[PDB]
Amino acid sequence: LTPAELIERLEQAWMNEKFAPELLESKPEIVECVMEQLEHMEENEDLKVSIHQMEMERIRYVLSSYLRCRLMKIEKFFPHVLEKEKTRPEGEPSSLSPEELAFAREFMANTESYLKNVALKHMPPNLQKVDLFRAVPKPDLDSYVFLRVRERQENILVEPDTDEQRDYVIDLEKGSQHLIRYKTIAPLVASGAVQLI
Amino acid sequence: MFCEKAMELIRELHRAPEGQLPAFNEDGLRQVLEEMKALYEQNQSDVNEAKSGGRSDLIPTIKFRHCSLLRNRRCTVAYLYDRLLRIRALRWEYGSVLPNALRFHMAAEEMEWFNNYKRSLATYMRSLGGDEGLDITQDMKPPK
Amino acid sequence: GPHMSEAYFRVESGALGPEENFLSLDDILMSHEKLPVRTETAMPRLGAFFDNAVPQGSKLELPLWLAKGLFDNKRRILSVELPKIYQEGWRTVFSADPNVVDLHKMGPHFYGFGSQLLHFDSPENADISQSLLQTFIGRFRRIMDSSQNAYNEDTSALVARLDEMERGLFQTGQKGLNDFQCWEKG
Amino acid sequence: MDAAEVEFLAEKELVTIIPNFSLDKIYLIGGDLGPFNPGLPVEVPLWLAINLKQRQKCRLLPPEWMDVEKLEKMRDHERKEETFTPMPSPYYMELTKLLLNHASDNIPKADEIRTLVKDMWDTRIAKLRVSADSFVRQQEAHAKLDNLTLMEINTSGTFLTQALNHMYKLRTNLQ
């Protein structure tokens, strides 16, 4: 994977994460390799130095934004992000890096402890327990999103409402742009077939 | 009747714009917890009169107090939770050290939650790369 | 801090769907709004708020959360009444021109409250539901035009007539347009 | 996503400059640039072009599509179409903005270009509101918008998705 391709995949993940209503798959290969590239370029005529530094800043910003985006999602849906990872089948791609997982567990422990000490333990006997998995909203997979097709895919399911007889299918042509519920095309975001914008 | 005090907590917060953190309402919190205590006690005796007096005619009043208990609890948790969401924003907007005027409106337990969050975040960011990882609380805007 | 709006993740509302969000401050304010109800049984030791009991068949205005709690398909404890604003008269009037109605005065959570009103399995549920949807569809354009300042009209008069959810949507349209214009300047 | 971030992406587009300095082929992550030679044309990322420009180390050349006559026809073509027509660039608003703000003295009839580009934008966003209104009135659950650019999509984007999200919930709150 070329350094150029690396930055390209970084920006793709950055955009997908921005618009997807749920936390997407962890991309260790990208974060780590980009971090290295940034450190290797830290090992530093002047015009050439300025230009290199300028590109570094561009890459830095994208990585930082992407990472902040993922932390925001982790914090908003911490109980669901943890439950999904706990039940993930061995072998399936994870949506949490080791560090994000630790961070999420800590956010959970910190919040439960706070709620327990400040109010929960002071409530009637059978009202002291609050299931945060049920109290905290889950990611709304029905959210609408715009996308760009980078790899052709036929038979995308469109479900206007609750009545299945209204369902129909469409084809996603390379280079086309669409507006649709995220839920139906979710697996295409994961594989790279489409790009959220 | 019941749960009016709990609503004061909610309104006070909802009126505070841009994540502003108003003073922790200790009295409101106390009074709600006290209302829940009373409600629980009255229901305990009534559920007893309905167990030793054939007062199944008290069930309506019983569920009534029960709904009020769940409501008081919902408001309490929502209030406290939202405040934590604003306190969390403080770390990103003002940094590791909070202005004392901002700390003044926080409860002792909230400062503790803040410090634990501060530490977890620092640890996370420190793990990103080789040397001191990466401070993602910086570079909030794209290069000029 | 003005830009602290991005680091503050308030729990959003869920009242437009099946259930409201437990931690949503807005849904909590919404479910506090009163609803017309008639008791189907006496409630001992409670008349003080309205054995010092509350007579059956009493006409009461109870907050939505309590009404929900004491309700069940059967008229066991309560029988719920639809607010006039969601009855045939008003929905026919809404049908003539959705934009003419002040949803702040008749709200402020018109869509949210009306959506949660469906939990009382009223015979008119289908009509209530269709009405909420068509009302939104009919005021959508006015909201997009104004929030994006398409005609250079003062938006103050429109904002005052928007329900809480519409105000949020309006704010988003304004934010997106404003952001672009400022980027356009400096 | 903010307009600034959309511009960030636009800044990756290649533009042609006339350097007034000498420089060896630089090896940047994402593409080698140059070599750079005085008075000779070379393609570089828009962000570099803008920086060098500010350093008074080059002059920017107007993209071929950034021409009055051409822009007038595109604008006219846009009006006759019900859907959105292919734009000269995926970032025409950004290239016009940045080029006129940092190299207007290098763009012929800059004022006329600014006016035409603005009218192109005004024409398209009006068409967007119209299209969105009919999309909503027919309660559609999907639409194709092949020629809308990122800046145009993003400016109305959050508004449109939130509105549709509210509608989807209103259309499914019974079943």
UniProtKB/Swiss-Prot annotation, chain A:
Q: Sorted alphabetically, which InterPro entries does this protein's record hold?
A: GINS_A, GINS_bundle-like_dom_sf, GINS_Sld5, SLD5_C, Sld5_GINS_A
The entry's keywords: Acetylation, Chromosome, Cytoplasm, DNA replication, Nucleus, Phosphoprotein
Q: Which family does it belong to?
A: Belongs to the GINS4/SLD5 family.
Please give the biological process terms from Gene Ontology that the record holds: DNA-templated DNA replication; double-strand break repair via break-induced replication; inner cell mass cell proliferation
Q: What is this protein called?
A: DNA replication complex GINS protein SLD5
Q: Does the keyword Repeat apply?
A: no
| SUPFAM superfamilies documented for this protein | GINS helical bundle-like, PriA/YqbF domain
Its localization reads: Nucleus; Chromosome; Cytoplasm
Q: Return the GO cellular component terms, semicolon-separated.
A: CMG complex; cytoplasm; GINS complex; nucleoplasm; nucleus
Q: What induces it?
A: Significantly up-regulated in aggressive melanomas.
What is this protein's function per UniProt? Required for correct functioning of the GINS complex, a complex that plays an essential role in the initiation of DNA replication, and progression of DNA replication forks. GINS complex is a core component of CDC45-MCM-GINS (CMG) helicase, the molecular machine that unwinds template DNA during replication, and around which the replisome is built.
User: Signal sequence: where?
Assistant: none
Designated gene of the protein: GINS4
Spell out the subunit comment. Answer: Component of the GINS complex which is a heterotetramer of GINS1, GINS2, GINS3 and GINS4. Forms a stable subcomplex with GINS1. GINS complex interacts with DNA primase in vitro. Component of the CMG helicase complex, a hexameric ring of related MCM2-7 subunits stabilized by CDC45 and the tetrameric GINS complex.
The species this protein was found in: Homo sapiens
UniProtKB/Swiss-Prot annotation, chain B:
* Protein's name according to its UniProt entry: DNA replication complex GINS protein PSF1
Q: What does this protein do?
A: Required for correct functioning of the GINS complex, a complex that plays an essential role in the initiation of DNA replication, and progression of DNA replication forks. GINS complex is a core component of CDC45-MCM-GINS (CMG) helicase, the molecular machine that unwinds template DNA during replication, and around which the replisome is built.
Assigned GO CC terms? CMG complex; cytoplasm; GINS complex; nucleoplasm; nucleus
Its annotated compartments are: Nucleus; Chromosome
UniProt key word GTP-binding = no
Similarity-based family: Belongs to the GINS1/PSF1 family.
Q: Which GO terms describe its biological process?
A: DNA strand elongation involved in mitotic DNA replication; inner cell mass cell proliferation
| Assembly description | Component of the GINS complex which is a heterotetramer of GINS1, GINS2, GINS3 and GINS4. Forms a stable subcomplex with GINS4. GINS complex interacts with DNA primase in vitro. Component of the CMG helicase complex, a hexameric ring of related MCM2-7 subunits stabilized by CDC45 and the tetrameric GINS complex.
State the conditions that upregulate or repress this gene: Significantly up-regulated in aggressive melanomas.
From Swiss-Prot, chain C:
Does Nucleus count among this protein's keywords? Answer: yes
Q: Name one GO cellular component term.
A: GINS complex
Matching entries from CDD domains are given as:
GINS_A_psf3, GINS_B_Psf3
- As recorded in UniProt, coiled-coil segments are none
| Region span, Not essential for folding and stability of GINS complex, but may regulate accessibility to the central complex pore | 4-19
| Protein family | Belongs to the GINS3/PSF3 family.
Q: Which InterPro entries match?
A: GINS_A, GINS_bundle-like_dom_sf, GINS_Psf3, GINS_Psf3_sf, PSF3_N
Organism listed in the record: Homo sapiens
Q: Where does the protein end up? A: Nucleus; Chromosome
- Gene3D superfamilies registered for this protein in UniProt: 1.20.58.2050
Keyword entries, A-Z: Chromosome, DNA replication, Nucleus
Q: What does this protein do?
A: Required for correct functioning of the GINS complex, a complex that plays an essential role in the initiation of DNA replication, and progression of DNA replication forks. GINS complex is a core component of CDC45-MCM-GINS (CMG) helicase, the molecular machine that unwinds template DNA during replication, and around which the replisome is built.
Q: What is this protein called?
A: DNA replication complex GINS protein PSF3
Domain of life where this protein originates = Eukaryota
The UniProt subunit note reads as follows: Component of the GINS complex which is a heterotetramer of GINS1, GINS2, GINS3 and GINS4. Forms a stable subcomplex with GINS2. GINS complex interacts with DNA primase in vitro. Component of the CMG helicase complex, a hexameric ring of related MCM2-7 subunits stabilized by CDC45 and the tetrameric GINS complex.
Per the record, the major location class is nucleus
UniProt keyword Nucleus, yes or no: yes
Q: Which Pfam families does the UniProt entry name for this protein? A: PSF3_N, Sld5
Curated annotation (Swiss-Prot), chain D:
Which UniProt keywords are given for this protein, alphabetically ordered? Answer: Acetylation, Chromosome, DNA replication, Isopeptide bond, Nucleus, Phosphoprotein, Ubl conjugation
**Residues bearing N-acetylmethionine?**
1
Biological process, per Gene Ontology: DNA replication; double-strand break repair via break-induced replication
Q: Does the keyword Iron-sulfur apply?
A: no
A cellular component term from Gene Ontology for this protein is: nucleoplasm
- Where does cross-link Glycyl lysine isopeptide (Lys-Gly) (interchain with G-Cter in SUMO2) occur? 109
Q: What is any Pfam family matched here?
A: Sld5
UniProt-listed Gene3D superfamilies: 1.20.58.1020, 3.40.5.50
| InterPro entries on file | GINS_A, GINS_bundle-like_dom_sf, GINS_Psf2, PSF2_N
Assembly state and interactors? Component of the GINS complex which is a heterotetramer of GINS1, GINS2, GINS3 and GINS4. Forms a stable subcomplex with GINS3. GINS complex interacts with DNA primase in vitro. Component of the CMG helicase complex, a hexameric ring of related MCM2-7 subunits stabilized by CDC45 and the tetrameric GINS complex.
Which family does the record claim for this protein?
Belongs to the GINS2/PSF2 family.
The record's function comment reads:
Required for correct functioning of the GINS complex, a complex that plays an essential role in the initiation of DNA replication, and progression of DNA replication forks. GINS complex is a core component of CDC45-MCM-GINS (CMG) helicase, the molecular machine that unwinds template DNA during replication, and around which the replisome is built.
Kindly provide the name given to this protein in its UniProt entry. DNA replication complex GINS protein PSF2
Write down the species.
Homo sapiens (Human)
Gene that encodes it: GINS2
